[PDB]
């Protein structure tokens, strides 16, 4: 049952796996202050990040509680219990527009909150499989916050630059995915071809299978090659699609 705890007494680790992975293993934990079940994640072997993340909360971000090197790296986060958008697109095969609008707006608010922190937090790895649902009739939360420090990649990331608009580019592809139920650039196979398509400004083929013209418009301006022409999240949130309902 209970096998470990954080340095102060706050978080208790249970010997019951709730998730595995090639780098990250997740256990039932308990926040003994509030009696709330949390995710105790151990990574296989972060200063300034933990700092930002520990004191962060927002309705569209998975709570980050704490992190420390155990003597593996431990991350304690909110426990999400309803799967991700990616599993949601498998379950229901499509996403209808009232939901697409609402959830995409929420992703954008969560991103905007990250970018407006001082210093800005750049997610750098947003995809449908790390956006988590609160419930079937509920809202979304952006997860895997602490993990980008160890396709949805804006072209400039290949020359190891990145800036806020790299999240906009990945949001674009997320929305594209949510509006198509398929992995963008799946007409490609390897990374090298996606690299060539992207850095010559050649869009995913799936772009042409977006039924709502306004949504197609939005995806288009998120995924521009030059980043200074990409929509700001301010621009995006003022588009008719998001201002309508």
UniProtKB/Swiss-Prot annotation:
Active site residues per record: 144
Sequence positions that bind chloride: 64, 75, 145, 147
Disease: Pseudohypoaldosteronism 2C: An autosomal dominant disorder characterized by severe hypertension, hyperkalemia, hyperchloremia, mild hyperchloremic metabolic acidosis in some cases, and correction of physiologic abnormalities by thiazide diuretics.
Known role: Serine/threonine-protein kinase component of the WNK1-SPAK/OSR1 kinase cascade, which acts as a key regulator of blood pressure and regulatory volume increase by promoting ion influx. WNK1 mediates regulatory volume increase in response to hyperosmotic stress by acting as a molecular crowding sensor, which senses cell shrinkage and mediates formation of a membraneless compartment by undergoing liquid-liquid phase separation.
Lineage: Eukaryota, Metazoa, Chordata, Craniata, Vertebrata
Species assigned in the record: Homo sapiens
Name the record gives this protein: Serine/threonine-protein kinase WNK1
Assembly with partners or alone: Interacts with WNK3. Interacts with WNK4; inhibiting the activity of WNK4. Interacts with SGK1; promoting its activation. Associates with the mTORC2 complex. Interacts with UVRAG. Interacts (via amphipathic alpha-helix region) with EMC2; promoting the ER membrane protein complex assembly.
Subcellular location(s) per record: Cytoplasm; Nucleus; Cytoplasm, Cytoskeleton, Spindle
Location of the Protein kinase domain: 12-242
Post-translational note: Ubiquitinated by the BCR(KLHL3) complex, leading to its degradation. Also ubiquitinated by the BCR(KLHL2) complex.
Family, as annotated: Belongs to the protein kinase superfamily. Ser/Thr protein kinase family. WNK subfamily.
Gene assigned in the entry: WNK1
Transmembrane segments: none
The record's note on its domains: Disordered regions undergo liquid-liquid phase separation (LLPS) for the formation of a cytoplasmic membraneless compartment that concentrates WNK1 with its substrates, OXSR1/OSR1 and STK39/SPAK. The RFXV motifs mediate recognition with downstream kinases OXSR1/OSR1 and STK39/SPAK.
Tissue expression as described in the entry: Widely expressed, with highest levels observed in the testis, heart, kidney and skeletal muscle.
Residues annotated to bind ATP: 22, 77-80, 127
Domain of life from the UniProt record: Eukaryota
């Amino acid at each position: 049952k209970a096998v470990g705890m954080s340095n102060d007494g706050r978080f208790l680790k249970f010997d019951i796996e709730i998730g595995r992975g090639s780098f990250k293993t997740v256990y039932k934990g308990l926040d003994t202050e509030t009696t709330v079940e949390v995710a105790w994640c151990e990574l296989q072997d972060f200063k300034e990040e933990a700092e930002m993340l520990k004191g962060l909360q927002h309705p569209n971000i998975v709570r980050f509680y704490d992190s420390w090197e155990s003597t593996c790296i431990v991350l304690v986060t909110e426990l999400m219990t309803s799967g991700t958008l990616k599993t949601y697109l498998k379950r229901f095969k499509v996403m209808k527009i009232k939901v697409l609008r609402s959830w995409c707006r929420q992703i954008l608010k969560g991103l905007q909150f990250l970018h407006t922190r001082t210093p800005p937090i750049i997610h750098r790895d947003l995809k449908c499989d790390n956006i988590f649902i609160t419930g079937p009739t509920g809202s979304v939360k952006i997860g895997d916050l602490g993990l980008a420090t160890l396709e949805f990649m804006a072209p400039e990331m290949y020359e190891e630059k990145y800036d806020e608009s790299v999240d906009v580019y990945a949001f674009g592809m997320c929305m594209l995915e949510m509006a198509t139920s398929e992995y963008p650039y799946s007409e490609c196979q390897n990374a090298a071809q996606i690299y060539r398509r992207v850095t010559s400004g050649v869009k995913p083929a799936s772009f042409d299978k977006v039924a709502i013209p306004e949504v197609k418009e939005i995806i288009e301006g998120c995924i521009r090659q030059n980043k200074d022409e990409r929509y700001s999240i301010k621009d995006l949130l003022n588009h008719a699609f998001f201002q309508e309902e």
